[PDB]
Amino acid sequence: TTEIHPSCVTRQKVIGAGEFGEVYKGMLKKEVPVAIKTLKAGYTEKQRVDFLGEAGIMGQFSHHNIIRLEGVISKYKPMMIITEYMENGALDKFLREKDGEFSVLQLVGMLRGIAAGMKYLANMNYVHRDLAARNILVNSNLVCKVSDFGLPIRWTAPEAISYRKFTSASDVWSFGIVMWEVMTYGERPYWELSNHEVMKAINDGFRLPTPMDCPSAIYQLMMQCWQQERARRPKFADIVSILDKLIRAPDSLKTLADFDPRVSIRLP
Numbered sequence: 102t103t104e105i106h107p108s109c110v111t112r113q114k115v116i117g118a119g120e121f122g123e124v125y126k127g128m129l130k131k132e133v134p135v136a137i138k139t140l141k142a143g144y145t146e147k148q149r150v151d152f153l154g155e156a157g158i159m160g161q162f163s164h165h166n167i168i169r170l171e172g173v174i175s176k177y178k179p180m181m182i183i184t185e186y187m188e189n190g191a192l193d194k195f196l197r198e199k200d201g202e203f204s205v206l207q208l209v210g211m212l213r214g215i216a217a218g219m220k221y222l223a224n225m226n227y228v229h230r231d232l233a234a235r236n237i238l239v240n241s242n243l244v245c246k247v248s249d250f251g252l253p254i255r256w257t258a259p260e261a262i263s264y265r266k267f268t269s270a271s272d273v274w275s276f277g278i279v280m281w282e283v284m285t286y287g288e289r290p291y292w293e294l295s296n297h298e299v300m301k302a303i304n305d306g307f308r309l310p311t312p313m314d315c316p317s318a319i320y321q322l323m324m325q326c327w328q329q330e331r332a333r334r335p336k337f338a339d340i341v342s343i344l345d346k347l348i349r350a351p352d353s354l355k356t357l358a359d360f361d362p363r364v365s366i367r368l369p
């Protein structure tokens with residue numbers, strides 16, 4: 102994996118926490134902004150294996166919709182994982198701060214990009230296990246990049262919760278939840294239901310209702326991601342294909358699913 106010399110890296114601001122270190126925004130040497138995850142003195146053998154293993158898997162991904170690794174510092178302490186930096190930050194916070202500001206076509210385009218990144222990961226035999234809008238970064242072209250910042254009952258498929266079966270098909274369930282997050286501008290899935298109430302509702306057959314202003318085709322697709330039977334869910338190749346066809350014939354997105362009102366206002 103590309104080894105970066107520490108003299109080329111400047112840590113500027115803390116932006117998060119790692120498993121045994123912090124996460125920073127900084128600059129990498131024509132300076133480019135970067136995000137930097139460190140592994141601090143005293144880390145265990147397993148932590149080092151997991152940290153360098155993470156850099157190793159990230160280094161082999163090369164896709165428009167997957168966060169790009171700039172390189173690693175392994176020859177000096179503290180060790181570092183260095184990625185490109187996305188000014189617009191995480192998708193969930195981004196949408197909540199930009200409520201109502203995008204077109205349907207822009208929102209669906211974000212979903213196609215996420216789906217393309219997930220198709221790539223699944224094809225590379227990588228199961229994400231924590232796909233959610235909080236783990237997707239947005240650049241200044243509105244391009245979404247699948248990432249994993251570490252630690253999600255309400256995003257997780259029933260078989261993964263029940264017996265720890267994490268596969269690309271449980272990632273498809275999570276993707277359906279991400280579709281709902283995007284189309285609602287970052288609403289909390291299942292609102293104030295507790296984790297136990299969410300699992301009970303899912304087991305009883307209930308599913309998230311349609312977002313406001315949501316294309317019928319998009320709601321139909323997210324519903325098929327939430328089939329109880331894992332084998333019936335679309336594969337990521339199916340999701341990408343459908344989203345690409347809807348975008349390329351954008352009148353297909355003008356037909357909206359009915360929104361169930363929770364509140365009735367009667368006026369003359």
Ligand SMILES: Cc1ccc(C(=O)Nc2cccc(C(F)(F)F)c2)cc1Nc1nc(-c2cnccn2)nc2c1cnn2C
Pocket residue numbers: 116117118124136137138155159162167168182183184185186187188189190191222229238247248249250
């Ligand atoms: C430094 C770093 C190390 C690893 C990862 C990361 O995504 N790792 C990862 C691990 C397994 C699988 C994948 C995936 F497959 F790509 F998704 C990615 C991301 C980052 N970059 C980050 N960027 C950012 C960030 C980047 N741009 C704007 C705002 N924040 N935040 C991060 C992180 C890590 N944690 N946090 C909170």
